A paper describes a structure:
Our subsequent work demonstrated that the HEPN protein with a RX4–6H motif is the toxin which cleaves mRNA in vitro in the HEPN/MNT (SO_3166/SO_3165) TA pair in the model psychrotrophic bacterium Shewanella oneidensis. Furthermore, antitoxin SO_3165 binds to toxin SO_3166 at a rare 2:6 ratio to form a hetero-octamer, and this binding is important for the antitoxin to block the toxicity of the toxin. Specifically, structural and biochemical studies of the HepT/MntA TA pair (SO_3166/SO_3165) in S. oneidensis show that the GSX10DXD motif of antitoxin MntA is responsible for transferring three AMPs to HepT and that Y104 in RX4HXY in HepT is the site that receives three AMPs from MntA. We found here that MntA antitoxin acts as an adenylyltransferase and catalyzes the transfer of three AMP moieties onto toxin HepT to block its toxicity, representing a new type of interaction between the toxin and the antitoxin.
The results clearly show that substitution of the Y104 residue of HepT prevents adenylylation by MntA. We determined the crystal structures of HepT/MntA and HepTY104A/MntA at 3.08 and 2.6 Å, respectively. Similarly, a (HepT)6-(MntA)2 hetero-octamer was found in the ASU of HepTY104A/MntA. In contrast, this additional electron density map was no longer present in the HepTY104A/MntA complex. Comparison of the polyadenylylated HepT and unmodified HepTY104A revealed that they were nearly identical with an RMSD of 0.396 Å over the 953 Cα main chain, except for the loop containing Y104, which was rotated clockwise nearly 180°. The MntA molecule in HepT/MntA was almost identical to its counterpart in HepTY104A/MntA, with a maximal root mean square deviation (RMSD) of 0.26 Å over 98 Cα and 0.29396 Cα, respectively. Although substitution of Y104 in the RX4HXY motif did not affect the toxicity of HepT, this substitution clearly reduced the ability of MntA to neutralize HepT.
Residue numbers in the entry:
A (entry chain A): 4 to 30, 38 to 127
B (entry chain F): 3 to 35, 38 to 127
C (entry chain H): 3 to 103, 107 to 133
D (entry chain C), H (entry chain B): 2 to 133
E (entry chain G): 2 to 131
F (entry chain I), G (entry chain D): 2 to 101, 105 to 133
The structure:
Amino acid sequence: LNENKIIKLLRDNIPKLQLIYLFGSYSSDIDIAVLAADTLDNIARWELAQKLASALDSDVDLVDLRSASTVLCQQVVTQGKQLWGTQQDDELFAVKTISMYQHLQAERQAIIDDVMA
Amino acid sequence: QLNENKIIKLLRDNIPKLQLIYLFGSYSQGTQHSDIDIAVLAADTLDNIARWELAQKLASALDSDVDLVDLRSASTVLCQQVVTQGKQLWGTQQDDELFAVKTISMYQHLQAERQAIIDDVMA
Amino acid sequence: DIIINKIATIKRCIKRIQQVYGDGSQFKQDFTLQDSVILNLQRCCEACIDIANHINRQQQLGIPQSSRDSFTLLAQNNLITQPLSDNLKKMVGLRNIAVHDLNLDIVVHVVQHHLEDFEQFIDVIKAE
Amino acid sequence: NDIIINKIATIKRCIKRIQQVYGDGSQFKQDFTLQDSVILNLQRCCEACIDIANHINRQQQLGIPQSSRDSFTLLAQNNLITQPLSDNLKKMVGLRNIAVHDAQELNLDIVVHVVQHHLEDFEQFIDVIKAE
Amino acid sequence: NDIIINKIATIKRCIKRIQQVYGDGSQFKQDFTLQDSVILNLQRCCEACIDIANHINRQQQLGIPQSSRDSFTLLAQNNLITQPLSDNLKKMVGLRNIAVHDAQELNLDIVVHVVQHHLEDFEQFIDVIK
Amino acid sequence: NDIIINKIATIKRCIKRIQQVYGDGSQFKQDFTLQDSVILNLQRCCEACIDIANHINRQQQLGIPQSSRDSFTLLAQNNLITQPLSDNLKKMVGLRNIAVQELNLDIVVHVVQHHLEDFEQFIDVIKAE
Amino acid sequence: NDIIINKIATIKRCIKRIQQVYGDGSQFKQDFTLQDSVILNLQRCCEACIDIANHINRQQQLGIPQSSRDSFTLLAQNNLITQPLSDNLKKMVGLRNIAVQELNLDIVVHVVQHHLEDFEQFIDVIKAE
Amino acid sequence: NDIIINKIATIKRCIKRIQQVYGDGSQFKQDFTLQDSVILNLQRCCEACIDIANHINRQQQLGIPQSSRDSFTLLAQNNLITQPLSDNLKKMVGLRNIAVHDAQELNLDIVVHVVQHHLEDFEQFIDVIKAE
């Protein structure tokens, strides 16, 4: 992965960008998460994914952390590799993510227990 | 390389009264990037579900997706492709030549019948 | 105009099969009368294919992969019933066997029991 | 069924207590103790609703929530709540999220707006479940 | 090759068939049964001719024809057929199309001009393949 | 682990939607929309299984699969699924190339009627971890 | 060549069934079987285009495609499709993933309403031939 | 680190609010609003502590906390808080859970006991963390 291509492509296209994470198998698809000051238009985000897809000659899943689920925010915080953004913003995002996830586990554990026999 | 010996063996061990085996996909021309396309002719037509099952059996043995074509029930268009681009891996020369002219003749008749249809959809 | 002239050929070809195959006393014995019936059955078979291909053509129902596919395309769009589709494709197979390579108890059987299928196909098509 | 009634009852008790403590609104913004009571009873309403929603999710096996707000999305995707009400409850979860994970960047004008106009979203959500 | 020898026997069997059914030709042009016969046995010769053309075009790796014409054209373009015999048979499968598929615009003159002077054409193709 | 929990949920949801849409058959082979739904939900099942298999192959360090079928071959060689179930799951990988027709719709009915239990058997082995 | 003629036929057939099944956006909203139909026929369109592209790349000896997307770049680098249509066809390559679904349904609707013509444009450029 | 500075500040703010609201105790068992204020400020103290725990565990890679409770156990097994303080913080989380989610089974004498004798568990947690 040319991380610089990923960094540039998302800086040139995402207003007020704050964090970029590479996550998934590469840290099928290259899984990339971004956090900006606003949530991105869902269609615009898919189209920006395909531009990254073309430039990296591979499938790309671009996740907007401002509108992504708690479960998948937790995965980005657990396994992700930060490629851009300050150390402060990463630690803020982690503490908010990790806390919300422990709260969600309390709410839904009875559901996961019943679906896993 | 493609292991044509295991293709031959696997089909012989599983198809009763087998007569022809053809390799005809991208793998027959230059093994491009892809289905492995294989055509067989036996004395009977094969059960379609049984034929799909043996495709997956070869797929497992060759670690790639496999399309197994029963020429006794395949279209004229697809029979023409097997004789045009196919590589015979088993069977007599007599059975191959019988199949070829039967196919090629049927195909030139179908081209006469359907040419106006072809012309309209590609213009 | 193509379909009406093809239906005309089918009607005059069938009537020609019927006249020459009379009682069938000698069909099996003299070949010139086998030749006439076999070619006029082929003509009937060919003409149905052209009617079918003309209809598929005027309604973009698909590209036939084989001669039998001409009737399969009409049946998949509910323009002939699938029992009639299977009967017409049976005749396509006999045309194939006549053209490329015919036991003639098969032709006597079609002549005596299966010409109706030609006549039912033209009765449908013209009805639309 | 046992657990749903109690939650329903908890929502009503918490609604009333918010109303009694917010009284006329006058001294609410200038006394941190009223704020605490109202804010803590709002969180109770939200959490009780999530528990009702997840309990229904579990008994009818509609899915695994990926976030707290999704518990209401699963009720809407199976047409057991109207989606205008789904989005109102989801907005209430986000405010709980703010009041819990970030104490001081609550804007209390939103809190009083919820009190004055959106507490009936709890009673609509509660108005739908019961009859099911 | 067995496919060649079987066709060639088909051609010879069907030419004689043509010649016997049309002995005198008094009642040829008003009895169209003996011509259902001659038209049928005519295209068996054509069919047979096309099959060796097809068979040889494939074995010698000159290309696979998509029409009966292209089959005779490829053998001429590789100089195994005399080229006007390529046209003499390309014109014979063309006569046959009109003969079977459009039987009322069939001049019926060429019918008999072809069983007349051009029936040998099948059997120079036949000895040229031997 | 969230990846395995959601893939098992996706498999269950698709198996139910397959059964609900196929019904008794009857109208299935005559509505291309119900064939498309079943076929696409079968692919979803296969991919979710491949994703489960690859995640297990990686966290348990059994090796790197070179292909979708190698994902199940690694689980079978470490005896976490039986060889018959391994071979059944590989068979379904073939379904991907059946979307891209009536020669095949009995393949699909065959799979619907006889191999959905292989999906449920694979997730029962995975739940028992 | 039969290979490209039949692929163009399937693309046309799939575009028709997408339009027929989607309608005016009617109830495509909350009925999972028509979204499945639309999604799978869009996949079929994408695969048929990739196969047409690969057949031209290999018939015209433009190179060996390294990916489904690289298949369209080889045509674009030899000017048999323009760059915008190449990039439009490439962004369709991404569609086969989101089969494996509700705020991704806006993606699907977006493609149905604005990118069908991209497939159509591609087959008419190929019909030049 | 800046995050730990703000969580320690929040813990400080909330402890005095508990103190200031509980005054002498003469009215606490009586008034629902002072119970609500005290309980909500205990929750904030608990969450600020949990966030410190989650932050240290992540950024020095001691593990992924499954729940708020294990977040304190992982700090204890790497000997950055004493075991006794780990279990006190773990039991304060549980009392809050009963206090916010099921108050009608809440033993307020436990809350009064925590208010009077266990608020230094938080302050002991802050003195450890701060003395890194």
